[PDB]
């Protein structure tokens, strides 16, 4: 099946800036190619076909061009509808086949995040499970770097996390951490702590409590 | 004019199909092939195949051949993806698609869960958690099922500073997510705080108040 390589996974650009993004294949595919933008809604629009042809609904900013298996998405001056998804398509053989995607988020300056640890309330723990949450907020790159400790072990595999979308008013992300604990582990152990690092932090930044203690 | 509708979203046990319908209009059906095409959350498009409406013929993705099956009915102008023996790596959008347009998207979600309201625990503010002027507060809404829930506070007067997380899917199969806000820590004895959760798929509502008090 023909592969086709996107790059870059992930841009970071400023309102105004020229961009371009890059696919390419693996076999020859003659200019059956098109390029896809994805949505923040998750609705995807066509912005060029047969390689270097623009979809009669996508505005004239995007360009397309491409030199044997090297097939590049311009977008010539960078407006906030573009921040988005965008996906290359082959039709030149079976299987049809997709790159792998290329992010575009809106680039900022760095920005620290501000850390915040919550230990499990008592009406969870009531009920035979500790929940312990680290909030990591209004921080530049989405990059982040979370670890728990209880009782200064570091933990494995019984933590999740999810971000948030890209801030409209600030540009920034915010991340929340769960660690699950079975009530029983949780009150064992005293310490508990998630340590952060962050390209805006010189030095790691931990947040602790110790359990039962107000 | 060219459009292309498909159902919401759906919920399968594993081990069961789904048949997805694509009902098309503003063009001559049989005259381009309809394909279509899966994302997992989070991750990129994958092509599982097409059929010529003009004659039933297929071209498949190899990795769907042996449980993907699609039919049209030309008299409703309808196109259909049958897949079969379900498993969690099944759940995604599914969208149907022609040359030029592509539909919503139908969001499938493979699950032996059963419905569950959520519980609702305070992120309560604390020291461990007050950064200089600025506190932090939430709500963990865990262990429900289905998707979606909604969090507001203080019926949507407060905004400023509000984080409600994607949620997650936890290991026992139901959804946790959190919701916070940064407030002045000074407010914490002038001002209630109170997240106000609903949860349509099982049409629940919890309004649970966040508090500091003594510990
Ligand atoms: C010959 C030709 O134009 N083929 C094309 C061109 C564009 C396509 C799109 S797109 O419009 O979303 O890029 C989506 C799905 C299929 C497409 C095909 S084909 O697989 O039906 O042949």
């Known amino acids: 099946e023909i592969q086709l390589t996107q790059s870059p996974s992930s841009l970071s650009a400023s309102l105004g800036e020229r961009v371009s993004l890059t696919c390419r294949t693996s076999?020859?595919?003659?200019?059956?190619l098109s390029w896809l933008q994805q949505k923040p809604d998750g609705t995807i629009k066509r912005l060029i076909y047969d390689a270097t042809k623009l979809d009669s609904g996508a505005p004239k900013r995007f360009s397309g061009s491409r030199s044997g298996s090297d097939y590049s998405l311009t977008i010539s001056s960078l407006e906030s509808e573009d921040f988005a998804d965008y996906y290359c398509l082959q039709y030149a053989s079976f299987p049809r086949t997709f790159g792998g995607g290329t992010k575009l988020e809106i680039k900022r300056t760095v920005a620290a995040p501000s850390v915040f640890i919550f230990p499990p309330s008592d009406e969870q723990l009531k009920s035979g499970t500790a929940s312990v949450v680290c909030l990591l907020n209004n921080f530049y790159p989405r990059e982040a770097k979370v670890q728990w400790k209880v009782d200064n072990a570091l933990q494995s595999g019984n933590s999740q996390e999810s971000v948030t979308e890209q801030d409209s008013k600030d540009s920034t992300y915010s991340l929340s951490s769960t660690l699950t604990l079975s009530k029983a582990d949780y009150e064992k152990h005293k310490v508990y702590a998630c340590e952060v690092t962050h390209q805006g932090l010189s030095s790691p930044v931990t947040k602790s409590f110790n359990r039962g203690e107000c | 004019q060219v459009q292309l509708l498909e159902p919401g979203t759906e919920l399968v046990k594993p081990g069961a199909s789904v048949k997805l319908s694509c009902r098309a209009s503003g063009y001559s059906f049989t005259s381009y092939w309809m394909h279509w095409v899966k994302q997992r959350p989070g991750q990129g498009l994958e092509w599982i195949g097409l059929?010529?409406?003009?004659?039933?013929?297929?071209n498949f993705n190899d990795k769907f051949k042996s449980r993907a099956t699609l039919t049209v009915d030309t008299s409703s102008s309808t196109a259909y993806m049958q897949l079969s023996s379900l498993t969690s790596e099944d759940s995604a959008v599914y969208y149907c698609?022609?040359?030029?347009?592509w539909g919503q998207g139908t969001l499938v979600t493979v699950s032996s869960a059963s419905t569950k309201g959520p519980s609702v625990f305070p992120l309560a503010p604390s020291s461990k958690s007050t950064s200089g002027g600025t506190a932090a507060l939430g709500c963990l809404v865990k262990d429900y099922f289905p998707e979606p829930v909604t969090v507001s506070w203080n019926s949507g007067a407060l905004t400023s500073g509000v984080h409600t997380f994607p949620a997650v899917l936890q290991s026992s199969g139901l959804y946790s997510l959190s919701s916070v806000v940064t407030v002045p820590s000074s407010s914490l004895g002038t001002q209630t705080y109170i997240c106000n959760v609903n949860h349509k798929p099982s049409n629940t509502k919890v309004d649970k108040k966040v508090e500091p008090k003594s510990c």
């Open positions: 059929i010529d409406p003009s004659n039933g013929r297929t």
């Open positions: 076999q020859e595919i003659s200019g059956y």
């Open positions: 698609v022609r040359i030029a347009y």
